[PDB]
Amino acid sequence: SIGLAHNVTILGSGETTVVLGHGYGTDQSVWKLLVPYLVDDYKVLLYDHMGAGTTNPDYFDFDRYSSLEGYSYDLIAILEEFQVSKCIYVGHSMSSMAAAVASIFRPDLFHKLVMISPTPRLINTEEYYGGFEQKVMDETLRSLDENFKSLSLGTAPLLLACDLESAAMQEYCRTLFNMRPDIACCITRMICGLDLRPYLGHVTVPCHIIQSSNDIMVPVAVGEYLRKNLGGPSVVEVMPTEGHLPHLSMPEVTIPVVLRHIRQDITD
């Protein structure tokens, strides 16, 4: 079963299903503080994307997961297996973009997308600022495999905007280093090379874009870029948070914002 392969869990009850999709380096446990505020009002489906440390390495196809589309098509299959349609999809960066692509092919499966720290592309061009320069990225990725742990540990405090000794950091590193090393490196290279800009004008489901005010992975202007380039309606809310995973590191601020966007539609 694809649901079993993705450790799908179902909780709550209701006519509307919320689907929670964790981002890079985490698993569905990242949602543990949000779930209590959903369980009374919604059915909730949680899953781990393929290659998370909780998943079977034998199911990781290095060809399919070298681009984001494979994750999009897996998500469709998960939703179909559990008879989910018109869901409220809540995702962190990588996952929210995979759902956006999925929604082009199956808009019937999505009522809206709630996106925490999304970006369609990290690498700068002459006309687009994603935060990272190609030639520096090239140097860093050349020695990624032998340096995965040291580079990840070295950058995580700025990535998360948390101290190395903090509880949020310990939680992130626990799941990050649970991935098998070759799988982690494949997913990392996939993320660093993504360019989903060609898809944006064909996304038409409503998108709720939730960003930290200071996120080393997401220049603040990327949210407005998404609003201007998505094909349907969207709302952009920059939060008084720092870090790329504000749902993990600053839940006291982030959870009420996520809940508002789950509960309140921007279309009729």
Residue numbers in the entry: 3 to 270
Manuscript excerpt for this entry:
Striga seeds require host-derived strigolactones (SLs) for germination, and corresponding antagonists could be used as germination inhibitors. In Striga, the receptors responsible for SL-induced seed germination are evolutionarily derived from a KARRIKIN INSENSITIVE 2 (KAI2) receptor and have arisen through gene duplication and new functionalization replacing the karrikin ligand by SLs. Among the several Striga SL receptors, S. hermonthica HYPO-SENSITIVE TO LIGHT (ShHTLs), ShHTL7 is the most sensitive to SLs. It is assumed to play a crucial role in regulating Striga seed germination.
Previously, the structure of ShHTL7, co-crystallized with Triton X-100, showed that the hydrophobic tail of the ligand, which includes the phenoxy group, interacts with several amino acids in the receptor cavity. These interactions provide the basis for the tight binding of Triton X-100 and its blocking/inhibition activity, together with those that take place with the polyethylene repeats at the outer rim of the ShHTL7 binding pocket. Building upon this work, we co-crystallized ShHTL7 with the triazole urea derivative KK007, after incubating them together, and soaked the obtained crystal in 1 mM Triton X-100 solution. Thus, we determined a crystal structure that showed KK007and Triton X-100 bound to ShHTL7, where KK007 was covalently linked to the catalytic Ser95. This structure showed that Triton X-100 left enough space in the active site to accommodate small covalent ligands targeting Ser95, and, hence, suggested that the combination of both moieties might generate efficient and Striga-specific inhibitors. Therefore, we attached the alkyl benzene moiety, which corresponds to the hydrophobic tail of Triton X-100 without the methyl groups, to the triazole urea scaffold, which led to the two compounds KK023-N1 and KK023-N2. The presence of the triazole urea scaffold in KK023-N1 and -N2 makes covalent binding to the active site serine in ShHTL7 likely, as shown for KK007 and the D14 inhibitor KK094. Our docking model of KK023-N1 bound to ShHTL7 also suggests that the compound does not reach deep enough in the ShHTL7 binding pocket to use its potential for covalent linkage with the catalytic Ser95. Structure analysis revealed that ShHTL7 possesses a large ligand-binding pocket among other SL receptors in parasitic and nonparasitic plants. Also, the ShHTL7 binding pocket is composed of nonbulky residues, compared to OsD14 and ShHTL5, and this explained the basis for the ligand selectivity.
